[PDB]
Design a protein around this motif. Structure first.
Motif, mmCIF file in Angstrom:
data_model
loop_
_atom_site.group_PDB
_atom_site.id
_atom_site.type_symbol
_atom_site.label_atom_id
_atom_site.label_comp_id
_atom_site.label_asym_id
_atom_site.label_seq_id
_atom_site.Cartn_x
_atom_site.Cartn_y
_atom_site.Cartn_z
ATOM 1 N N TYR A 1 10.364 28.908 33.488
ATOM 2 C CA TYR A 1 9.301 29.286 33.249
ATOM 3 C C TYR A 1 9.122 29.147 31.664
ATOM 4 O O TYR A 1 7.940 29.507 31.438
ATOM 5 N N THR B 1 5.997 40.386 31.348
ATOM 6 C CA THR B 1 5.623 39.704 30.203
ATOM 7 C C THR B 1 4.307 39.470 30.092
ATOM 8 O O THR B 1 3.667 39.239 28.876
ATOM 9 N N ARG B 2 3.537 39.312 31.204
ATOM 10 C CA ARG B 2 2.070 38.868 31.277
ATOM 11 C C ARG B 2 1.161 39.867 32.263
ATOM 12 O O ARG B 2 1.937 40.722 32.771
ATOM 13 N N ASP C 1 3.407 30.223 39.924
ATOM 14 C CA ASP C 1 4.790 30.957 39.945
ATOM 15 C C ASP C 1 4.926 31.373 38.807
ATOM 16 O O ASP C 1 5.645 32.232 38.388
ATOM 17 N N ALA C 2 4.964 30.424 37.559
ATOM 18 C CA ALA C 2 5.008 30.814 36.245
ATOM 19 C C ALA C 2 4.438 32.428 36.031
ATOM 20 O O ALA C 2 5.097 33.086 35.530
ATOM 21 N N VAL D 1 7.895 40.295 35.822
ATOM 22 C CA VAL D 1 8.762 40.766 34.670
ATOM 23 C C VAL D 1 7.808 41.673 33.757
ATOM 24 O O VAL D 1 7.925 42.157 32.800
ATOM 25 N N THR E 1 13.684 30.495 36.970
ATOM 26 C CA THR E 1 12.643 29.236 37.562
ATOM 27 C C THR E 1 12.361 28.277 36.391
ATOM 28 O O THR E 1 11.367 27.370 36.711
ATOM 29 N N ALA F 1 6.110 35.413 37.991
ATOM 30 C CA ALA F 1 7.412 35.899 37.487
ATOM 31 C C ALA F 1 6.940 36.526 36.198
ATOM 32 O O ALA F 1 7.389 37.585 35.972
ATOM 33 N N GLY F 2 6.193 35.872 35.315
ATOM 34 C CA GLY F 2 5.765 36.551 33.954
ATOM 35 C C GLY F 2 5.009 37.750 34.011
ATOM 36 O O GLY F 2 5.025 38.672 33.187
ATOM 37 N N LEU G 1 13.274 35.094 33.230
ATOM 38 C CA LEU G 1 11.919 34.181 32.979
ATOM 39 C C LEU G 1 12.616 32.623 32.819
ATOM 40 O O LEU G 1 11.694 31.862 32.822
#
Lengths: 49, 53
Positions: free
Chosen positions: B6, A42-43, A32-33, A40, B4, A36-37, B1
């Motif tokens: 993160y 970001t990653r 999950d981290a 978005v 949740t 999302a990252g 970000l």
């Protein structure tokens, strides 16, 4: 011995799951981290993979 | 970000930090830009008042 052999095993066996079961949870949000990252952006996506 | 959880609320703090100050730098800029432009407004002399020249 065998009596004490596995009776330990299972219990330690129990400890096993509890670790990885958490550990799964660890990776779980870890996944999950990522998403999302990556969601978005970001990653990268590779990480999610 | 941070929805949740993160990142580090610390982290997000840092992110907002510049994002806070960044625009301020911008403010430092637009203030700057107007400055000279104002001078360029000074150039092209404006009659500070009206009347027969």
């Amino acid at each position: 011995q065998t009596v004490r052999s596995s009776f330990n095993n299972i219990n330690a066996s129990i400890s096993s799951i509890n670790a990885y079961k958490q550990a799964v949870v660890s990776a779980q949000s870890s996944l999950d981290a990522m998403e999302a990252g990556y969601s978005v952006g970001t990653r990268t996506i590779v990480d999610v993979l | 970000l941070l929805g949740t959880q993160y990142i580090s609320k610390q982290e997000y703090d840092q992110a907002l930090a510049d994002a806070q100050q960044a625009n301020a730098a911008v403010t430092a800029a637009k203030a700057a830009v107007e400055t000279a432009r104002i001078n360029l407004a000074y150039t092209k002399v404006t009659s500070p008042i009206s009347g027969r020249i």
